[model samples]
Target: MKVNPNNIELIISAVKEEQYPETELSEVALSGRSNVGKSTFINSMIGRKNMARTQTLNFYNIDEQLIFVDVPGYGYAKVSKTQREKFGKMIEEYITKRENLQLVIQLVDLRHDPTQDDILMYNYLKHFDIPTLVICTKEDKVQKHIKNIKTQLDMDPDDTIVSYSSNNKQQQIWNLIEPYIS
Candidate 1:
């Protein structure tokens, strides 16, 4: 189903567990490294110019039925180590404890192998038996590194992985995730 731009709205940017919305709606958490177009792709997915950024754990109401939870971008060298730990705990609690979490959308750049942080994050998700949808952004700009990415991330052979571009790939992205969200 095509989502209406009017239906997509920011729920909140939660820095603590207390700020999290207690809705029964299923959530799909978007995970990616810094400057990798998680924000840009979300706008394209919702048919909006902008509705989210990279620094906060943003929860968006998807047609009032589902939630898109965007975890803050990691591997930014500018952030302090203490700050990274806080963000880590926050994300860990959300992903591990949230009863409504249905899926995790992990994005990696198409040109490079998964980073150390990326590998660790993916392991955490798997440790909890959470389902993940790995998306390779900048498919148009980068040379494809599918095999290396898959191997580095240790993504299951059966799990879905797609080379994605936010401009023309929204439909394809939506198509791939239709079953999970719907």
Candidate 2:
């Protein structure tokens, strides 16, 4: 099946692992911190406004061939520790169990180094043998910090690190991810 980028639609918002729909479509998940601009990234990528949300595993019809899983942002300090812990477990379980999951888009801020939580999550993805791509947000605001940001995250310069913004880079992201879909 060919993906029609304009025909994407939300399929389900699974708040629990049991709620996830069983489908053959490969899933590409997005994850980041509270204010790392995931919603913006999602909206830009999906070509819609406010199309994704947190506290939910959103399955989207990426043109019938693929499903985009919008995982919630972790490491929000305002939430209670217990709640945070619960979400942590939930996210980990989902990532570990989803059989058709092809890749995880681990987003980070371009203005600063990856946080401790980011490192932990990145390591976890590596441990799981999950292919993860690092996307650094806010490219225009801070040109000087991207290399440092990459270094801070321990990402090699040769790695597939995307310096992304909302300005027409959405297709490039998809291009990088297309091979993983099949």
Candidate 3:
């Protein structure tokens, strides 16, 4: 039998209760603040609109082997503090409990620096004890020469930041995730 090296497999959307028995394959999650280019990143990565929303949860099976999980954006709509707390709990519940959940792809904006909200999210992910790939989207917005210097002085010494653009190959993203790939 002959098979193309690249082909797509089935895609399944996940629910809170249904989130159980998540694919035995390692799960990688993409999370970001509202309008942080996560949707565009998925669209760009999959070569189409796998889902309709930038702020809604999604699951994309790029192929039979690789699956990507996209969590909805948090801290938007200016909901009440209680509502925010509820959302936080929900996120913590799933992220911490999911057996297959492995690497988290936390996207950030290139034009902006991380904020308290971003730090909170990081803390939550860390609290869950998950590995992460910090993707700073829109790397093309900055010139290469400046990017090198910016990378050295701008990013935290311990934090590993991978700059990326939609147009470029996401080898770095995959590289971080490859260990989890079956």
Q: Which stretches of candidate 1 lie over 4 Å from their true place?
A: 78-81, 142-144
What ordering of candidates by lDDT runs from best to worst?
1, 2, 3
lDDT of 1: 0.80
The TM-score of candidate 2 is 0.87
lDDT of each: 0.80, 0.78, 0.63
- Could you tell which candidate, 1 or 2, scores higher by TM-score? 1
lDDT of 3 at 17: 36
What are the models' TM-scores?
A: 0.89, 0.87, 0.76
Model 1 vs. true fold: TM: 0.89
Q: Which numbered prediction scores highest in lDDT against the true structure?
A: 1
Give the lDDT of residue 11 in candidate 3: 62
| 98 Cα displacement, candidate 3 (Å) | 0.7
- Pairs that collide, model 1: none
Q: Which residue pairs show collisions in model 2? A: none
Using TM-score as the yardstick, the better of models 1 and 3 is 1
Q: For candidate 1, lDDT tens digit of each residue in 105-129? A: 9988887789998898888888888
Better of 1 and 3 by lDDT: 1
